[PDB]
Design a protein around this ligand. Structure first.
Ligand SMILES: OC[C@H]1O[C@H](OC[C@H]2O[C@@H](O[C@H]3[C@H](O)[C@H](O)[C@H](O[C@H]4[C@H](O)[C@H](O)[C@H](O)O[C@@H]4CO)O[C@@H]3CO)[C@@H](O)[C@@H](O)[C@@H]2O[C@@H]2O[C@H](CO)[C@@H](O)[C@H](O)[C@@H]2O)[C@H](O)[C@@H](O)[C@H]1O
Ligand code: NA
Ligand code: NA
Length: 367
Protein backbone atom coordinates (compact mmCIF):
# COMPACT_ATOMS: atom_id res chain seq x y z
CA UNK A 1 0.00 0.00 0.00
CA UNK A 2 2.77 2.55 0.66
CA UNK A 3 4.36 3.62 -2.62
CA UNK A 4 8.00 4.52 -3.18
CA UNK A 5 8.98 8.01 -4.31
CA UNK A 6 10.82 6.30 -7.17
CA UNK A 7 7.94 5.28 -9.40
CA UNK A 8 10.44 3.32 -11.52
CA UNK A 9 12.19 1.49 -8.70
CA UNK A 10 13.58 -1.92 -9.60
CA UNK A 11 11.40 -4.96 -9.05
CA UNK A 12 13.51 -6.00 -6.07
CA UNK A 13 13.34 -2.51 -4.51
CA UNK A 14 9.57 -2.32 -4.96
CA UNK A 15 9.26 -5.82 -3.48
CA UNK A 16 11.36 -4.90 -0.44
CA UNK A 17 9.21 -1.89 0.38
CA UNK A 18 5.96 -3.83 -0.18
CA UNK A 19 7.17 -6.70 2.00
CA UNK A 20 8.35 -4.41 4.80
CA UNK A 21 4.90 -2.81 4.67
CA UNK A 22 3.32 -6.25 5.12
CA UNK A 23 5.60 -7.66 7.80
CA UNK A 24 5.70 -4.59 10.03
CA UNK A 25 2.44 -5.29 11.84
CA UNK A 26 3.55 -8.56 13.42
CA UNK A 27 7.33 -8.43 13.12
CA UNK A 28 10.44 -6.40 13.67
CA UNK A 29 13.64 -6.88 11.68
CA UNK A 30 16.86 -6.60 13.66
CA UNK A 31 19.78 -4.65 12.26
CA UNK A 32 23.41 -4.07 13.14
CA UNK A 33 25.95 -1.56 11.80
CA UNK A 34 29.20 -2.84 10.24
CA UNK A 35 28.16 -6.31 11.32
CA UNK A 36 30.40 -8.25 8.96
CA UNK A 37 33.37 -5.86 9.00
CA UNK A 38 34.71 -6.49 12.52
CA UNK A 39 33.66 -7.05 16.08
CA UNK A 40 34.91 -6.01 19.47
CA UNK A 41 37.52 -8.78 19.57
CA UNK A 42 38.15 -9.66 15.93
CA UNK A 43 38.88 -8.21 12.52
CA UNK A 44 39.90 -9.78 9.22
CA UNK A 45 37.52 -12.72 8.85
CA UNK A 46 35.61 -12.38 5.60
CA UNK A 47 32.42 -14.02 6.91
CA UNK A 48 31.86 -13.34 10.59
CA UNK A 49 29.64 -11.24 12.87
CA UNK A 50 29.47 -10.74 16.66
CA UNK A 51 25.69 -11.08 16.25
CA UNK A 52 26.02 -14.51 14.61
CA UNK A 53 28.63 -15.62 17.10
CA UNK A 54 26.07 -15.07 19.88
CA UNK A 55 22.83 -16.17 18.24
CA UNK A 56 23.80 -18.38 15.33
CA UNK A 57 22.19 -15.91 12.92
CA UNK A 58 23.18 -12.80 11.02
CA UNK A 59 21.16 -9.62 11.49
CA UNK A 60 18.25 -9.17 9.08
CA UNK A 61 19.37 -5.61 8.34
CA UNK A 62 22.97 -4.67 7.64
CA UNK A 63 24.00 -1.07 8.14
CA UNK A 64 26.99 0.41 6.36
CA UNK A 65 28.63 3.83 6.32
CA UNK A 66 30.19 5.78 3.45
CA UNK A 67 32.03 8.65 5.14
CA UNK A 68 35.29 9.20 3.30
CA UNK A 69 34.08 7.77 -0.02
CA UNK A 70 33.54 11.31 -1.24
CA UNK A 71 37.21 12.10 -0.64
CA UNK A 72 38.35 9.13 -2.72
CA UNK A 73 39.56 7.21 0.31
CA UNK A 74 40.21 3.45 0.06
CA UNK A 75 38.39 2.93 3.34
CA UNK A 76 35.69 4.72 5.30
CA UNK A 77 36.14 6.85 8.41
CA UNK A 78 36.24 3.72 10.59
CA UNK A 79 38.75 2.00 8.31
CA UNK A 80 36.24 -0.26 6.57
CA UNK A 81 37.67 -1.01 3.14
CA UNK A 82 35.18 -0.03 0.43
CA UNK A 83 35.86 -3.04 -1.81
CA UNK A 84 35.30 -5.35 1.15
CA UNK A 85 32.16 -3.38 1.98
CA UNK A 86 30.85 -4.01 -1.54
CA UNK A 87 31.58 -7.73 -1.08
CA UNK A 88 29.82 -7.79 2.28
CA UNK A 89 26.77 -5.92 0.94
CA UNK A 90 26.48 -8.39 -1.93
CA UNK A 91 26.94 -11.32 0.46
CA UNK A 92 24.25 -10.15 2.88
CA UNK A 93 21.85 -9.37 0.07
CA UNK A 94 22.49 -12.78 -1.50
CA UNK A 95 21.30 -14.37 1.74
CA UNK A 96 18.13 -12.28 1.67
CA UNK A 97 19.21 -9.59 4.11
CA UNK A 98 18.39 -5.90 3.90
CA UNK A 99 20.98 -3.19 3.23
CA UNK A 100 20.96 0.32 4.69
CA UNK A 101 23.60 3.00 4.27
CA UNK A 102 24.36 6.21 6.16
CA UNK A 103 26.90 8.87 5.25
CA UNK A 104 28.95 10.89 7.68
CA UNK A 105 30.09 13.28 4.97
CA UNK A 106 33.37 15.11 5.62
CA UNK A 107 33.25 18.88 5.81
CA UNK A 108 34.20 20.17 2.36
CA UNK A 109 35.13 23.63 3.57
CA UNK A 110 37.68 22.55 6.17
CA UNK A 111 38.47 18.95 5.24
CA UNK A 112 37.41 18.00 8.76
CA UNK A 113 34.91 15.25 9.57
CA UNK A 114 31.13 15.49 10.03
CA UNK A 115 31.56 16.86 13.54
CA UNK A 116 33.51 19.87 12.24
CA UNK A 117 30.73 22.46 12.38
CA UNK A 118 32.24 24.86 9.84
CA UNK A 119 29.22 25.96 7.78
CA UNK A 120 28.89 24.24 4.43
CA UNK A 121 25.27 23.56 3.48
CA UNK A 122 24.55 27.03 2.11
CA UNK A 123 27.56 26.66 -0.19
CA UNK A 124 26.67 23.12 -1.32
CA UNK A 125 23.05 23.56 -2.39
CA UNK A 126 22.00 24.66 -5.88
CA UNK A 127 23.24 28.18 -6.49
CA UNK A 128 25.93 27.85 -3.85
CA UNK A 129 29.62 28.26 -4.66
CA UNK A 130 30.45 24.66 -3.73
CA UNK A 131 27.54 23.08 -5.62
CA UNK A 132 30.06 21.30 -7.88
CA UNK A 133 31.44 19.65 -4.74
CA UNK A 134 28.02 18.27 -3.80
CA UNK A 135 27.68 16.75 -7.27
CA UNK A 136 31.19 15.26 -7.10
CA UNK A 137 30.48 13.84 -3.66
CA UNK A 138 27.24 12.21 -4.78
CA UNK A 139 28.99 10.87 -7.90
CA UNK A 140 31.24 8.77 -5.66
CA UNK A 141 28.14 6.98 -4.34
CA UNK A 142 26.88 6.45 -7.89
CA UNK A 143 30.21 4.73 -8.63
CA UNK A 144 30.11 2.72 -5.41
CA UNK A 145 26.59 1.54 -6.22
CA UNK A 146 27.81 0.34 -9.64
CA UNK A 147 30.20 -1.95 -7.81
CA UNK A 148 27.21 -3.70 -6.30
CA UNK A 149 25.66 -4.68 -9.61
CA UNK A 150 25.44 -8.05 -11.26
CA UNK A 151 24.33 -8.89 -14.76
CA UNK A 152 22.21 -11.93 -15.48
CA UNK A 153 22.25 -14.35 -18.40
CA UNK A 154 19.76 -12.18 -20.28
CA UNK A 155 22.02 -9.13 -19.92
CA UNK A 156 19.86 -7.41 -17.35
CA UNK A 157 21.57 -5.51 -14.56
CA UNK A 158 20.52 -6.12 -10.95
CA UNK A 159 21.36 -4.31 -7.75
CA UNK A 160 20.76 -4.79 -4.07
CA UNK A 161 18.08 -2.41 -2.89
CA UNK A 162 19.52 0.11 -0.44
CA UNK A 163 17.74 2.04 2.29
CA UNK A 164 19.75 5.25 1.84
CA UNK A 165 19.71 7.37 4.99
CA UNK A 166 21.63 10.63 4.38
CA UNK A 167 21.95 13.86 6.32
CA UNK A 168 20.77 12.23 9.52
CA UNK A 169 20.07 13.71 12.97
CA UNK A 170 19.75 17.09 11.34
CA UNK A 171 17.72 18.48 14.23
CA UNK A 172 20.83 18.09 16.38
CA UNK A 173 23.71 20.57 16.27
CA UNK A 174 26.57 18.07 16.18
CA UNK A 175 26.97 17.66 12.42
CA UNK A 176 27.72 20.48 9.98
CA UNK A 177 24.34 19.92 8.29
CA UNK A 178 22.61 20.31 11.65
CA UNK A 179 20.55 22.99 13.34
CA UNK A 180 22.63 26.07 14.02
CA UNK A 181 24.94 25.43 11.07
CA UNK A 182 22.42 25.33 8.28
CA UNK A 183 19.10 27.09 7.90
CA UNK A 184 16.03 24.91 7.82
CA UNK A 185 15.29 25.96 4.24
CA UNK A 186 18.85 25.21 3.16
CA UNK A 187 18.69 21.76 4.75
CA UNK A 188 15.49 21.09 2.80
CA UNK A 189 17.22 22.27 -0.37
CA UNK A 190 20.13 19.91 0.33
CA UNK A 191 17.80 16.95 0.82
CA UNK A 192 15.70 17.70 -2.24
CA UNK A 193 18.79 18.08 -4.39
CA UNK A 194 20.15 14.77 -3.14
CA UNK A 195 16.96 13.00 -4.24
CA UNK A 196 16.75 14.84 -7.58
CA UNK A 197 20.39 14.13 -8.32
CA UNK A 198 20.39 10.44 -7.46
CA UNK A 199 16.88 9.51 -8.59
CA UNK A 200 16.35 11.85 -11.53
CA UNK A 201 19.72 12.95 -12.91
CA UNK A 202 21.69 9.77 -12.25
CA UNK A 203 18.68 7.48 -12.54
CA UNK A 204 19.46 5.22 -9.60
CA UNK A 205 16.48 2.89 -9.24
CA UNK A 206 17.54 0.80 -6.25
CA UNK A 207 17.14 3.35 -3.46
CA UNK A 208 14.63 3.75 -0.65
CA UNK A 209 15.09 7.11 1.12
CA UNK A 210 15.12 7.26 4.93
CA UNK A 211 14.68 10.42 7.01
CA UNK A 212 16.05 10.24 10.56
CA UNK A 213 15.84 13.04 13.17
CA UNK A 214 17.29 12.44 16.61
CA UNK A 215 14.78 11.88 19.42
CA UNK A 216 17.09 13.58 21.92
CA UNK A 217 16.35 16.96 20.33
CA UNK A 218 12.59 16.52 20.01
CA UNK A 219 10.25 17.98 22.62
CA UNK A 220 7.97 15.13 23.64
CA UNK A 221 5.15 17.63 24.32
CA UNK A 222 5.34 18.64 20.67
CA UNK A 223 6.67 15.57 18.91
CA UNK A 224 5.30 16.05 15.41
CA UNK A 225 6.55 19.62 15.13
CA UNK A 226 10.00 18.60 16.30
CA UNK A 227 10.07 15.57 14.04
CA UNK A 228 9.13 17.63 11.00
CA UNK A 229 11.83 20.27 11.52
CA UNK A 230 13.63 20.24 8.18
CA UNK A 231 11.25 17.68 6.68
CA UNK A 232 11.68 17.94 2.91
CA UNK A 233 8.26 16.70 1.85
CA UNK A 234 6.51 13.42 1.14
CA UNK A 235 7.85 13.44 -2.43
CA UNK A 236 11.36 13.00 -1.00
CA UNK A 237 11.01 10.39 1.76
CA UNK A 238 10.09 6.69 1.88
CA UNK A 239 11.01 5.74 5.48
CA UNK A 240 9.99 7.79 8.49
CA UNK A 241 13.00 6.97 10.66
CA UNK A 242 14.26 7.98 14.07
CA UNK A 243 17.55 7.80 15.94
CA UNK A 244 16.77 7.17 19.61
CA UNK A 245 19.56 6.28 21.99
CA UNK A 246 18.00 8.63 24.51
CA UNK A 247 15.14 6.49 25.85
CA UNK A 248 17.27 3.34 26.07
CA UNK A 249 19.63 4.48 28.82
CA UNK A 250 21.83 7.23 27.45
CA UNK A 251 24.26 8.26 30.19
CA UNK A 252 23.17 11.92 30.05
CA UNK A 253 19.47 11.13 30.46
CA UNK A 254 18.36 11.62 34.08
CA UNK A 255 14.87 10.17 33.51
CA UNK A 256 14.06 7.02 35.47
CA UNK A 257 14.07 3.69 33.66
CA UNK A 258 10.29 3.66 33.84
CA UNK A 259 10.02 7.14 32.38
CA UNK A 260 12.44 6.13 29.61
CA UNK A 261 10.47 3.03 28.72
CA UNK A 262 7.31 5.12 28.48
CA UNK A 263 9.09 7.70 26.31
CA UNK A 264 10.44 5.05 23.95
CA UNK A 265 6.94 3.71 23.41
CA UNK A 266 5.49 7.22 22.99
CA UNK A 267 8.19 8.24 20.51
CA UNK A 268 7.58 5.17 18.34
CA UNK A 269 3.80 5.48 18.62
CA UNK A 270 3.98 9.04 17.35
CA UNK A 271 6.52 8.10 14.67
CA UNK A 272 4.13 5.44 13.38
CA UNK A 273 1.21 7.87 13.45
CA UNK A 274 3.22 10.26 11.27
CA UNK A 275 4.17 7.45 8.90
CA UNK A 276 0.54 6.31 8.67
CA UNK A 277 -0.65 9.80 7.86
CA UNK A 278 1.94 10.11 5.11
CA UNK A 279 1.57 6.65 3.62
CA UNK A 280 5.12 5.69 4.59
CA UNK A 281 6.85 3.05 6.71
CA UNK A 282 8.43 3.84 10.10
CA UNK A 283 11.63 2.44 11.57
CA UNK A 284 13.93 2.86 14.53
CA UNK A 285 16.97 3.54 12.40
CA UNK A 286 19.53 3.88 15.21
CA UNK A 287 19.42 2.84 18.85
CA UNK A 288 21.26 0.91 21.51
CA UNK A 289 22.99 0.96 24.87
CA UNK A 290 26.71 1.58 24.46
CA UNK A 291 28.71 -1.18 26.13
CA UNK A 292 25.50 -2.98 27.08
CA UNK A 293 25.61 -2.13 30.75
CA UNK A 294 21.88 -2.55 31.36
CA UNK A 295 20.62 -5.90 32.66
CA UNK A 296 18.24 -7.57 30.22
CA UNK A 297 18.57 -4.59 27.91
CA UNK A 298 17.13 -6.35 24.89
CA UNK A 299 13.93 -7.73 26.33
CA UNK A 300 13.25 -5.11 28.99
CA UNK A 301 14.42 -1.86 27.43
CA UNK A 302 13.98 -2.43 23.71
CA UNK A 303 11.51 -5.20 22.84
CA UNK A 304 9.21 -4.66 25.82
CA UNK A 305 8.44 -1.00 25.16
CA UNK A 306 8.04 -1.61 21.42
CA UNK A 307 5.64 -4.50 21.95
CA UNK A 308 3.64 -2.63 24.62
CA UNK A 309 1.72 -0.56 22.10
CA UNK A 310 0.33 -1.75 18.76
CA UNK A 311 1.16 1.54 17.07
CA UNK A 312 4.74 1.54 18.36
CA UNK A 313 5.02 -2.08 17.21
CA UNK A 314 4.30 -1.12 13.59
CA UNK A 315 7.88 -0.04 13.04
CA UNK A 316 9.47 -2.30 10.41
CA UNK A 317 12.96 -2.61 11.84
CA UNK A 318 15.34 -1.58 14.58
CA UNK A 319 19.09 -1.12 14.04
CA UNK A 320 21.79 -0.88 16.67
CA UNK A 321 25.18 0.75 16.11
CA UNK A 322 28.60 -0.80 15.50
CA UNK A 323 30.79 -3.10 17.54
CA UNK A 324 34.05 -1.15 17.39
CA UNK A 325 37.23 -3.20 17.33
CA UNK A 326 39.07 -2.74 20.62
CA UNK A 327 42.57 -3.54 19.32
CA UNK A 328 42.26 -0.90 16.68
CA UNK A 329 40.13 1.81 18.27
CA UNK A 330 41.42 1.82 21.81
CA UNK A 331 38.18 2.08 23.56
CA UNK A 332 35.08 0.23 24.22
CA UNK A 333 32.16 1.00 22.05
CA UNK A 334 29.60 -1.61 21.08
CA UNK A 335 25.86 -2.05 20.80
CA UNK A 336 25.42 -5.75 20.06
CA UNK A 337 26.86 -8.40 22.36
CA UNK A 338 29.65 -10.84 21.70
CA UNK A 339 30.15 -14.23 23.33
CA UNK A 340 30.53 -13.85 27.07
CA UNK A 341 29.16 -10.31 27.20
CA UNK A 342 26.68 -9.82 30.06
CA UNK A 343 23.64 -9.28 27.84
CA UNK A 344 24.35 -12.18 25.48
CA UNK A 345 21.67 -14.50 26.90
CA UNK A 346 19.08 -11.72 26.87
CA UNK A 347 20.05 -11.02 23.24
CA UNK A 348 19.42 -14.70 22.52
CA UNK A 349 15.95 -14.19 24.04
CA UNK A 350 15.44 -11.13 21.83
CA UNK A 351 16.44 -13.18 18.78
CA UNK A 352 14.23 -16.06 19.87
CA UNK A 353 11.14 -13.84 20.12
CA UNK A 354 8.56 -14.70 17.52
CA UNK A 355 8.27 -10.97 16.77
CA UNK A 356 11.94 -10.37 16.00
CA UNK A 357 13.42 -11.52 12.71
CA UNK A 358 17.08 -12.07 11.99
CA UNK A 359 18.40 -13.17 8.58
CA UNK A 360 17.65 -16.83 9.22
CA UNK A 361 13.86 -16.47 9.38
CA UNK A 362 13.26 -13.69 6.86
CA UNK A 363 10.65 -14.44 4.27
CA UNK A 364 11.76 -13.77 0.70
CA UNK A 365 11.71 -9.98 0.66
CA UNK A 366 12.69 -9.44 -2.96
CA UNK A 367 9.91 -11.16 -4.80
O1 LIG B 1 32.00 7.04 19.76
C1 LIG B 1 31.04 6.80 20.76
C2 LIG B 1 29.82 7.69 20.54
O2 LIG B 1 28.65 6.95 20.80
C3 LIG B 1 27.44 7.62 20.50
O3 LIG B 1 27.25 7.96 19.15
C4 LIG B 1 26.65 6.78 18.67
C5 LIG B 1 26.32 7.04 17.20
O4 LIG B 1 25.21 7.93 17.18
C6 LIG B 1 24.89 8.72 16.04
O5 LIG B 1 25.26 10.15 16.20
C7 LIG B 1 25.45 10.71 17.54
C8 LIG B 1 26.35 11.97 17.49
O6 LIG B 1 27.71 11.63 17.29
C9 LIG B 1 26.24 12.99 18.66
O7 LIG B 1 27.45 13.03 19.40
C10 LIG B 1 25.03 12.91 19.61
O8 LIG B 1 25.37 13.26 20.97
C11 LIG B 1 24.31 14.00 21.59
C12 LIG B 1 23.23 13.12 22.23
O9 LIG B 1 22.39 12.53 21.26
C13 LIG B 1 22.33 13.92 23.17
O10 LIG B 1 21.55 14.87 22.46
C14 LIG B 1 23.15 14.68 24.19
O11 LIG B 1 22.26 15.41 25.00
O12 LIG B 1 24.02 15.56 23.49
C15 LIG B 1 24.97 14.90 22.65
C16 LIG B 1 25.86 15.95 21.98
O13 LIG B 1 26.92 16.34 22.85
O14 LIG B 1 24.48 11.62 19.57
C17 LIG B 1 24.18 11.17 18.26
C18 LIG B 1 23.17 10.05 18.46
O15 LIG B 1 23.79 9.12 19.32
C19 LIG B 1 25.53 7.93 14.83
O16 LIG B 1 25.13 8.15 13.45
C20 LIG B 1 27.05 8.04 14.98
O17 LIG B 1 27.42 9.38 14.61
C21 LIG B 1 27.49 7.66 16.41
O18 LIG B 1 28.54 6.69 16.48
C22 LIG B 1 29.72 7.11 15.78
O19 LIG B 1 29.68 6.66 14.45
C23 LIG B 1 30.80 7.07 13.67
C24 LIG B 1 30.58 6.61 12.24
O20 LIG B 1 30.48 5.19 12.15
C25 LIG B 1 32.11 6.51 14.24
O21 LIG B 1 33.20 7.06 13.52
C26 LIG B 1 32.20 6.84 15.73
O22 LIG B 1 33.29 6.20 16.38
C27 LIG B 1 30.91 6.46 16.43
O23 LIG B 1 30.74 5.05 16.36
C28 LIG B 1 27.33 8.91 21.33
O24 LIG B 1 26.27 9.72 20.87
C29 LIG B 1 28.61 9.75 21.24
O25 LIG B 1 28.56 10.81 22.19
C30 LIG B 1 29.88 8.92 21.43
O26 LIG B 1 29.93 8.54 22.79
NA1 NA C 1 6.83 -4.23 13.63
NA1 NA D 1 12.76 -14.42 16.31
Amino acid sequence: LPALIDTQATAETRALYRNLAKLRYKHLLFGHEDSLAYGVHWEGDMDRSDVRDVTGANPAVYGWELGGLELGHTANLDAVNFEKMQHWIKAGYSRGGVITISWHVFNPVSGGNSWDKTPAVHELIPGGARHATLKAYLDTFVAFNEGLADVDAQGNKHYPPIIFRPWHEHNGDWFWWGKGHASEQDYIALWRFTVHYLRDEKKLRNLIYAYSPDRSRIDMANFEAGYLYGYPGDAYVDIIGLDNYWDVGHEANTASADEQKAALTASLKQLVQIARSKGKIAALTETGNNRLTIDNFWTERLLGPISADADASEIAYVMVWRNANLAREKSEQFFAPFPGQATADDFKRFYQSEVVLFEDELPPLYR
